[PDB]
Each structure stands twice: as structure tokens, then as C-alpha cells.
Amino acid sequence: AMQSTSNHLWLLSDILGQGATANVFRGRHKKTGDLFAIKVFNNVQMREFEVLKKLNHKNIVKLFAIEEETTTRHKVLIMEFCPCGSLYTVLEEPSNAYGLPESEFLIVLRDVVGGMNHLRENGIVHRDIKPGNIMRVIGEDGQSVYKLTDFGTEEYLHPDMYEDLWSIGVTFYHAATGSLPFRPFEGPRRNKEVMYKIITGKPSGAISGVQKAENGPIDWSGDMPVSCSLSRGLQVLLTPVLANILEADQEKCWGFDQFFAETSDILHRMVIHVFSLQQMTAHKIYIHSYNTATIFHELVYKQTKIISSNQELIYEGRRLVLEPGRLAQHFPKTTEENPIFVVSREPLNTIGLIYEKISLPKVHPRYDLDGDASMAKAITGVVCYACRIASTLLLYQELMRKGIRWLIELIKDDYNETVHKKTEVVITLDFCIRNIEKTVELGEISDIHTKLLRLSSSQGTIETSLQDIDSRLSPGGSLADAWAHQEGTHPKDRNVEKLQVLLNCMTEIYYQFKKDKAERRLAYNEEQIHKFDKQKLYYHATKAMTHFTDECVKKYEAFLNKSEEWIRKMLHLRKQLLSLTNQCFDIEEEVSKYQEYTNELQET
Ligand SMILES: Nc1nc2oc3ccc(C4CCC(F)(F)CC4)cc3c(=O)c2cc1C(=O)O
Incomplete structure (x- = not known):
């Protein structure tokens, strides 16, 4: 049994929405078979309805036509399904x-x-x-x-x-x-x-x-x-x-x-993914496509408290220099899994991810169709939250490993550039300390050697303190990134999917309890299935939270605590290499004051 029209028909069982004014059934067209939303009112109109037909917009349900039902002659609205x-x-x-x-x-x-x-x-x-x-x-x-x-x-x-x-x-x-x-x-x-x-x-x-x-x-x-x-x-x-x-x-x-x-x-704002590598925090900068990179660094500061001048950016395994006028639409395209890592020379506190720590609500033994439905909805949403945080903690660790494996290569690039400036100073040193020996009034030359030998001696202390850093950036040299691969969780552990299996079982039981609530009562057979699956709903949630805290969080906090120490050791090595490179520039110009001094006397 069902109602019909000259062009549409709908079953009363396929009811969608039930309101005070009317009810909306899921119906079909008599000639095409296309599905429509049929609105049959239980109980001026011919004008305010035809004006709703011409209403055509992407965010408005199109009112197709107005027809009159066959049996009751009720005004029926044919709406978009x-x-x-x-x-x-x-x-x-x-x-x-x-x-x-x-x-x-x-x-x-x-x-x-x-x-x-x-x-x-x-x-x-x-x-x-x-x-x-x-x-x-x-x-x-x-x-x-x-x-x-x-x-x-x-x-x-x-x-x-x-x-x-x-x-x-x-x-x-x-x-x-x-x-x-x-x-x-x-x-x-x-x-x-x-x-x-x-x-x-x-x-x-x-x-x-x-x-x-x-x-x-x-x-x-x-x-x-x-x-x-x-x-x-x-x-x-x-x-x-x-x-x-x-x-x-x-x-x-x-x-x-x-x-x-x-x-x-x-x-109208585009998204720039930025991961604070020292704070172990992922961020999203909502910036207009026409803004400059100066405003971009301003938003990064308001979200990470990193000073704009100290923001050093990495992307795809290389450094990234942002011109202060470079528009945001010309920035490289970023994703949650390939952001712009931001590091700073100032020491930053290692925070990690901040999330609400929620526990499982207790399950009641009362056989209540409405109670079990509202209980199954909350407990399944909690596991979704713990499954959401688990994938976020996994992303944070995987983003951490790439940012660390990149930053060590960026430091090894700064080290190799210092070697280039070292070979420039060594070649100048030798070709000036020995070009004097060849030509060799005594004080004007003896003072140079007491100064040239001081340069070659302090230049060598740079060489020893540099090869030490080369020994620190080597595998197993008190700064390798091997611990990151051997501490936290990995996609090989498949922890996000292990939680997602128990989540689907809890959701199916939830959707079944959602159907069991529509039915006012269940038969004795269906009643015990509702009770048996209600107990499985607790064992699934308990098994998930145990695997979440005793594996996902523990490995994450062990990786995070190990990350806080490696950041200090990395910040210490960056300050040494910077000092050693500055000690190569100021002596590069100190040998510039003597390469032209006595080597070029004056005489006609
Ligand atoms: N044009 C409209 N199309 C509508 O399509 C619908 C299609 C499907 C459903 C179900 C809702 C709850 C569920 F059963 F668990 C899963 C699917 C509902 C609607 C619906 O409510 C509706 C209203 C209007 C309107 O205009 O009021």
C-alpha cells in the first residue's frame, strides 16, 4: 500500500523526515525511475511555491514541481533527493x-x-x-x-x-x-x-x-x-x-x-603546512594568496612564538629562503605529510601534541534500548578520538624522522661550505707564508712570522674541531638519527589500523543498537543478541584503550623524551659550527691584511 501522483509514487515505509507540518518520503518518477524527495502535507500557496521553483543555487535544494496526490488531493512538493x-x-x-x-x-x-x-x-x-x-x-x-x-x-x-x-x-x-x-x-x-x-x-x-x-x-x-x-x-x-x-x-x-x-x-585563505621540528607541533597557517612572506612569518610567530628573523625553513631536504615580498600563492605546495619544517637557533621547549585525555565511560547492565544507544554512541566516539590521536601521533613521529634526517644533511651542507672557505684560507696561507720565505728590516719580517704562525696554528685548531664535528655527524657519532627509527611507533606496527578494526566492530554494534532503538521492543532471540553484543562493545573498547596507552602513547612519550635530548645536542653543535665558521671568516680577512702588506713593498 502506498500513495501516488500523476508523475510520482512513494512507499510509506521509505519515510525520510517526519515533521509537524508534513512528512517527506523517498519516491520515484513514474516515467523515468529517478529518485526524488516527495513532501506530502498532512493538511497564496500557488505563488510562493512557484517562486521557489526558479530558485537555482548550488547550496539550495531545488524545488522541482508541485503536484496533487491522487487519493487525498493533497499538495505534494517534488524536491531534490x-x-x-x-x-x-x-x-x-x-x-x-x-x-x-x-x-x-x-x-x-x-x-x-x-x-x-x-x-x-x-x-x-x-x-x-x-x-x-x-x-x-x-x-x-x-x-x-x-x-x-x-x-x-x-x-x-x-x-x-x-x-x-x-x-x-x-x-x-x-x-x-x-x-x-x-x-x-x-x-x-x-x-x-x-x-x-x-x-x-x-x-x-x-x-x-x-x-x-x-x-x-x-x-x-x-x-x-x-x-x-x-x-x-x-x-x-x-x-x-x-x-x-x-x-x-x-x-x-x-x-x-x-x-x-x-x-x-x-x-579566501590558502593553507601553508608548517611543522615546528623543535617543538614537535604541526600547524596550519591560514594566509591569503596575495599576502607577503613577512605576514606569513608573523602568523608563524603567533602560533609558535618563534621570532620571524630566527625562522629557518626546510623543504624537501633543502633549506628554504623566503623573500619578504614573495606572495603566498607562489610558495611551494604543502600537505600534512610534506610541510615546511621551521627550526630556530634559539632553544625551544619540546611540547609535542596536546590532546584531551578521555577515559571509557562505564557500561550499564540495564537493558534499555535508548540507554544502550546513547551509551554506544559516546563510547564509539571516544575510540574515534583515540584513533584520531593515534594517527596524529604516528604522523608527528614520521614527520619528525624526515625533519631530523633532513636537518642533519643541512648541517652537513653547512659543514661542507666551511671546508670550502677553509681550503681558500689554507691556499692563501701557504702561498703567503712561503712567498715570504723565498724573499727572505728583520723586525718587519719576524713580526709577520710570529703572526703568520699564530694564524696557521689557530686555523689548525679549527680543523681539529671541525673533523670532530664530522665525527659527530657520522653514523653512531653521538648525533645519529638511528634512534628515531628504533624508539616510537612506525607504520609497520600498523597501530592505527589495529585500532580501526575494533572501531568498525564497535560502529557496527552502534549502528545495530541505533536500529534496535527504532524498534520499540525486540524478540527474546534478538534481545540476547543485543545483550551479547553490548558486552562485546565493552571488550572491544577495553582492548583498544589498552593497546592505545600501553603501546601508542608509551612509545610516543619515549620518542618525545629522546627527541628533547637530541634537540639540545643539535643546538649545541650548531653553535659550535657557527663559531668555527665565523672563526674562518675573520681570519680570512686577517690574512687579507697581510697578503697585501709586506708582499707589496714600495720602490721605483
Ligand atoms: N530534500 C530532502 N532530501 C532528503 O534525503 C534523505 C536521504 C537519506 C536519509 C537517511 C537519513 C537517516 C538514515 F536513515 F539513518 C540514513 C539515510 C534522509 C534524507 C532526508 O531526510 C531528506 C530531507 C529532505 C528535505 O527537503 O527535507
């Missing part, structure tokens, strides 16, 4: 439990801004903008395309409306943290009066408010949480956009013009 679901469906997946991927987050902000801007050009106010109103379609290139459609909700209401840019800030915060900005203890339900008190608390610059105890305080914060998977350079640019659109004061609200301007400023 979005097989991936809504943004809320995307945020329900455990991989996005603590925030969307950074690239996926930029697609959301681009489509949402690009969609409402087209709606403002036509003059349509959305009133309610939530992840449920933002559909997801896969584009012809494989990247997601987000669209608006339903043009509210309790959690996304303005404080004055609780009694337009507000719900947009709550959506972006939810998409970036994987959680809501203003959450009471027992959730926005019976603590609804607390939720209103949280919004009327208007801390202006702060964007979050977590009541971690029943009827307790409200933990405010102006920055994003540590679990946020966005880069630190993106949080710096995203925080002021939200804080200025999350306060009830229309006097202090931004409006769409300043909002669209500052958001367009973020999307």
Missing part, C-alpha cells in the same frame, strides 16, 4: 562525535554562507537554521555539497525569540566541537529554565557554557575545546566570528554584512 541525509545525520556518526574534519568543516561553512547569501539577495529569512535543515549531496567530484531546504528548534533559538545569525553560530560550534555550546547537566529538557539562564548570562566573548553538575555552576570559555579537530590557526580565526554573533545585544551583533565579509575572508 539527498541520499546522504542532513548535517545532523553526519554529526551522529562517531568519527564526527568530537567535531567534523577540517576540510569537511570548510565545505559546510562555504555552502551555508553561499546559500543564505543567495537567499538574502532574494529576501528570504530562514528563521530556523539547524543541521536538520542542511542536507548533504555528493558532488560530481566526490566532495560533499550542502544545501538548505526547509524555509524553529529549541536548542537553536535566540534568547529574545526563546521566550537569525544565532542558530548559525550554534550550528558551526556543533559542527566544530561535535557538541552543543550551551548544555545544562541533564540536557536541555527539565533544565530548560537553566538553558534560558545560560543564554541570558551573555558572557559576550565566551562561546561555551557547560553545567557539569546538577544545579551547579556554568563553566564558561571563549575558546574551542581541546577535543576540537580543527587546526589551531583555524580556531584563532573562527572564535571571534562566533563570539560576536552569540550575544543578545543588537547593539553588539554583527549583522550579515560584517558576517559575510569576515567569513569570506576566511574562505
